[PDB]
Design a protein around this ligand. Structure first.
Ligand SMILES: NC(=O)c1ccc[n+]([C@@H]2O[C@H](COP(=O)([O-])OP(=O)(O)OC[C@H]3O[C@@H](n4cnc5c(N)ncnc54)[C@H](O)[C@@H]3O)[C@@H](O)[C@H]2O)c1
Ligand SMILES: NC(=O)c1ccc[n+]([C@@H]2O[C@H](COP(=O)([O-])OP(=O)(O)OC[C@H]3O[C@@H](n4cnc5c(N)ncnc54)[C@H](O)[C@@H]3O)[C@@H](O)[C@H]2O)c1
Ligand SMILES: [Ca+2]
Ligand SMILES: [Ca+2]
Ligand SMILES: [Zn+2]
Ligand SMILES: [Zn+2]
Lengths: 276, 276
């Protein structure tokens, strides 16, 4: 038996995934969930019963707040007076921690752990791993963690828990909370999600103009494969002169000249205000 | 034995791939290559000897111009007087045909066939197929073809050849040359290549700012997997409110408001002028 964990939001989207992976470890886990629906999922899918806050917090080592980001501060403030010095409070996302929503408690340990998801270019032999897009099922994924406050020794404990809840694991990285914020919302959402949206809009426009729907989808997804594999150095190669010409003109044609300033601290901080 | 094919540019990047796949069919093929280097590749890799134009064109049914797009017109003009009515001249790209570079010969058949490449989201059981990014090796790919001129019956012949040179095949679509031009340069190069470039630039910027290099790469490529799979309906699901918020603000933050006008005919035509 290892440390005691209290999992709040245990019946939510991340809650049930964590509960499922924690059942396969030696951690002692108490599950806290307010919704009937979530309590039912836990019961039906995992055979787990939920307990009260007081029961969950009794001799707790690690508190995982798998609750929405907009209420991490509120929930942390409710429970913090029950937490002894040296208890770890762990979030699964850097937003609420970055925004300064966690309690003013220098004596607590604050840890964030966010998954990468399985790589788009991967050679999972297991077909079931090839179809695990999210991670935490069969395909390996890298993780990113930050020790925001606490002793250096607590990093190891937080990282161990992270490796269990997100298993199976590829690589495990240590970052700061500021770096985590550059990654998300900055890189994965402001950049990646928006530009995939644009690609889908472009695809839809060629279909509007009469390209068969499935043809446009195959063409885009196949060119994304080869182009992405080269640009991201998954394989050797170099773009043809034609492709470079397209980027040459395509950059100023599509993009605002100041697009990369999304990574400025003021812009990152504002993106986090909007979702907290 | 089936139709006779003359493969020009037989020792180039596409030439050797086509030669390799045509060796596994019943087509009778003559190979024409001007460079010593290319003649050597054919000889060494495939055991094939090259022949003269005159020999290659004698009783030819299909001429494949696997030569650079900037000289398809010139090369087609050189050889066209040797081609009898009803001979197919086939290109592997829509650019030179769209630009009107092919000879003024109403009596010839003009056919374009361009591959999709293997889909970025695929469940190839064969690991060797999982690592074929380009296509024409082990992984299946969809193809797009156009009969630009000639009788309806010639489509079938062109498509058969296309299925052999690009094998193995997923789906085979029939398009117009105008539609092919929307797909490339429009969708795959002006859009897709440019936006992957932007994603790589963003990734590089988070590394400049201190994110570990491999962490940034894993994070981006893993989020591309899950986000792309949802946006392109490879799996069910819907973006969280946070992710939608990022796109909401991200679209006007990153993109020129007129970006989708790249698909206007004038812009497509100009993109093709630059590469022909
Ligand atoms: N969904 C994702 O893809 C994803 C990926 C990585 C990280 N995360 C992070 O996971 C965390 C949770 O997100 P989610 O998507 O699972 O949210 P969710 O809305 O699906 O689940 C939240 C759960 O918290 C419960 N809850 C609300 N108030 C509570 C309380 N006072 N006490 C106990 N439980 C309470 C809800 O009833 C619900 O079951 C967030 O920090 C989010 O950013 C989410
Ligand atoms: N490379 C790609 O990824 C790709 C993908 C799909 C389609 N295509 C299309 O394939 C065609 C050929 O492109 P490539 O990348 O193979 O080019 P390449 O430059 O690699 O090969 C061209 C070959 O043509 C030969 N050649 C030049 N002049 C010739 C002549 N007068 N007679 C005979 N041979 C001659 C060259 O010596 C060379 O070996 C183009 O239409 C291109 O758009 C290329
Ligand atoms: Ca987030
Ligand atoms: Ca092209
Ligand atoms: Zn994320
Ligand atoms: Zn292409």
């Amino acid at each position: 038996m290892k440390e005691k964990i209290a999992l709040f939001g245990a019946g939510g989207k991340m809650g049930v995934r964590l509960a499922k992976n924690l059942l396969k470890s030696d951690y002692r886990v108490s599950h806290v969930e307010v919704s009937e629906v979530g309590k039912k999922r836990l019961k039906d899918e995992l055979g787990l019963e939920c307990v009260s806050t007081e029961a969950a917090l009794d001799n707790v080592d690690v508190v995982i707040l798998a609750v929405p980001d907009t209420i991490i501060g509120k929930i942390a403030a409710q429970i913090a007076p029950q937490l002894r010095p040296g208890t770890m409070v762990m979030t699964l996302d850097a937003a609420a921690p970055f925004a300064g929503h966690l309690p003013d408690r220098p004596d607590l340990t604050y840890f964030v752990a966010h998954p990468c998801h399985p790589l788009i270019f991967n050679d999972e032999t297991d077909p079931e791993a090839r179809r695990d897009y999210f991670g935490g099922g069969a395909a390996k994924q890298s993780i990113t963690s930050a020790l925001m406050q606490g002793p250096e020794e607590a990093f190891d404990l937080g990282e161990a828990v992270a490796k269990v809840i997100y298993a199976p694991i590829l690589r495990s990285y240590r970052l700061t909370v500021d770096q985590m914020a550059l990654l998300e919302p900055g890189l994965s959402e402001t950049i990646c999600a928006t530009l995939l949206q644009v690609m889908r809009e472009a695809m839809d426009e060629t279909v509007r103009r009469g390209v068969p729907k499935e043809a446009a989808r195959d063409f885009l997804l196949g060119h994304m494969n080869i182009l992405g594999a080269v640009i991201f150095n998954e394989i050797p190669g170099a773009f043809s002169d034609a492709c470079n010409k397209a980027i040459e003109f395509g950059k100023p044609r599509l993009m605002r000249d100041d697009w990369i300033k999304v990574f400025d601290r003021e812009e990152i901080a504002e993106s986090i205000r909007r979702i907290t």
